[PDB]
Symmetry: C2
Amino acid sequence: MQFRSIIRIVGLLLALFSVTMLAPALVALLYRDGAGVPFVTTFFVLLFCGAMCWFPNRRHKHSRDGFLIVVLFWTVLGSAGSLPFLIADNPNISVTDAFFESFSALTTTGATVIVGLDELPKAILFYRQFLQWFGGMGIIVLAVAILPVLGIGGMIAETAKALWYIYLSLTIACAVAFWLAGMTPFDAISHSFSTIAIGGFSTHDASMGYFDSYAINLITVVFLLISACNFTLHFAAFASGGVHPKYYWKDPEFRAFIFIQVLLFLVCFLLLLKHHSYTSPYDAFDQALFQTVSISTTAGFTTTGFADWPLFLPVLLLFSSFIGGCAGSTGGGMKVIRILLLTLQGARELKRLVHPRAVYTIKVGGSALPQRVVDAVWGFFSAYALVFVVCMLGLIATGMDELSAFSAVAATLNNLGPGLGEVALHFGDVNDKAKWVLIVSMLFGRLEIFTLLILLTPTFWR
Amino acid sequence: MQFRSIIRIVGLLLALFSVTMLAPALVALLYRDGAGVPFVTTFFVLLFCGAMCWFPNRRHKHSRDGFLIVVLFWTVLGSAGSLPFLIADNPNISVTDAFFESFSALTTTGATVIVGLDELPKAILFYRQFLQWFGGMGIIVLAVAILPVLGIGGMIAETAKALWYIYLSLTIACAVAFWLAGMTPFDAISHSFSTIAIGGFSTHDASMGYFDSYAINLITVVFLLISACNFTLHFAAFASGGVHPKYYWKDPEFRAFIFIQVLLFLVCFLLLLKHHSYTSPYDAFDQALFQTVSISTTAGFTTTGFADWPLFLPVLLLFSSFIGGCAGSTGGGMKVIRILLLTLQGARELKRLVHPRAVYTIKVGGSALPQRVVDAVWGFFSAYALVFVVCMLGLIATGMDELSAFSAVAATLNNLGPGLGEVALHFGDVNDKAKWVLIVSMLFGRLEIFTLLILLTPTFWR
Ligand SMILES: [K+]
Ligand SMILES: [K+]
């Protein structure tokens, strides 16, 4: 087991986290407004705690450890990251609310309990976006860095930098475009933070409701679509050539993400027209395209409130939220390939009933899928259902009413952010226990459900 | 394919159905009350249509036919059985309402759209119960009769009579007991019809709310539990003497059904106590014990309205509605063995993550399950979820609101069918399209989802 060498990495990570508190404290002296005293207190207590772990250890005793690591990386960082939200009496908020905000930020869930954030320190807002960006690193270097500790192919740090490039040259390349459709520079850095990590956080209390310019809406769209799609596939970029064209339409995962996106928008738009839910058919186009792309790819950004929207639309959207993101992106539904595979496998299951003496094989690209991963997919989907209904009961038990709890889990297990059900979105004054439960829900939502469930099976130890 | 020999059995069934219209027409002349003109009109149009099918055929050209038949037996009979509810202007009701009532009746769904049935002809009420009883035959002789046409073991009419005996000596043995806790004989036969076929229909508009005597509540409980339990397992009754005892606690399906029932009751009761939802700690026991068994074993009978019940309870009940009935009984959730197996399979999936080079096998009784049935189970669960969310969308689109459509599907896909969500139960005045949707929902719910799904795959033909 050797937790003694695991704690080395934990403390090392706390120090590495401390060196990111100097990032919105450098906005606590730049932008004149508010208080950044906490951020510099935090940079201290964290560096101290972390190094108080790293130093009494120093042992690289390089399975059961890998999981425990990728649960500590969140459980600790998302806990430590609730410290600015505590000492700071600028948005003075409850400890549980602080935790909810920190975890929701770090998970790239994006569901706030701080109302009235439009008028707060330019730092405590920047921290909010920076968290999303930073966790948005984890969620994609953990689609590579796990291999040494864990198994994807158990079911190379060449790409640790090479990914950070695709990420940086995306947030920057977005910031320019955002501030070219005219946000304040601050808002265009802090909204690329949110839009690339597919998180949903904003500076405006109405998210993407500042400037109804189809410029920013239809920018957020294309940068979401880019961000919501398989950084290893993007990796056909720095790998010299810019021979992008064919690689995307090669992989059937992406091909499916595109069919899904198209169909979903199409139906949404067409119903928004049929229903006369928008004055101009153009605004219908806008709001439809932005809402489907944002909500289904696990983004969270809202440009409307579904005022004129037929209930069928926010419901079907909250459902399509279960399928968002080429696997190994910054999204976090039961990722696209999961649904692809699922439909394939079930299709088979329907075929076998007809001719049962027949040999049907699951075909993805060319090679067949093994009956060890099909089992894994099905088991995952089931587990997902379990977790969802369990936390739905947990919320109804917390005190919450039925539909609000349904929306809540459906928003924290996919890591959405919006209530999205029947305009019951706002978490601020929800039950406290509910806040904790929902935090759990988004920890599950991040760890793809299994790598936490196994933590409490006896079989894990030892 | 040869549909030509299929029509023989279809018409033969319309005639066999005609000769059961003389059964509540024999109550339209016995009990002085009401109008039985329809039942004798129906006995004619049905005998005529049926024989107009059987006669121009006569060919016993003894898979895909087995399926097409076991969809015809419901789709045809449940349509034909909507004929009394049409011509009769005593509860004069819309055609779609008539179909809803007939299909819900024959399915053992148990969800009425006729409010105020307390004051109706003693025949049209008896027809309502008789339907449930007759379908309650189908749902258990199709756990035998299918084998020649189809496959359970593709994934003997010795027992065709032998089942009808365990069924008859149960409805009779219940009718007596009901009329010994003092119902009118009519109400004690027509409630054994419903309580054995696990259907949920009643004579009283408040179902089991006539006489809050724990006598009848705790009779209905004990006859539900028996009826809700594996007639093939019961078959250890007529064969040899009363050597029942060991057989039950041998089979782990039943062994699981008992744990489930107990745990469910326990939590329910204990919460009805903690919440002070009942004046005396006796009525708490009563209502808990009756409600868990009724709602979870797919019965439908209600003795309360969940006035003081903590919301957590009707919700958890509506969910436990998904798993009800020893497999091959009169229930119709995703039957108990399914959930047992599912949990086993997922537990396994959770084990493989830890030690991945290991050989884990699924164990039920003694022999392991083959990896052709685990696949089938998982596929079934997935399909189930799919169907549910699809019909929930179909209903939210029909016009219904979100939570109501949810309760509706969750009640018709398992065949409960009380609303049960947050006191929005009553189907009578729901949208008209929605009624059709719900009929589909309960056809799926009856046919275990696959054996109708495959009917619309191209692969089925030919
Ligand atoms: K999000
Ligand atoms: K029922």
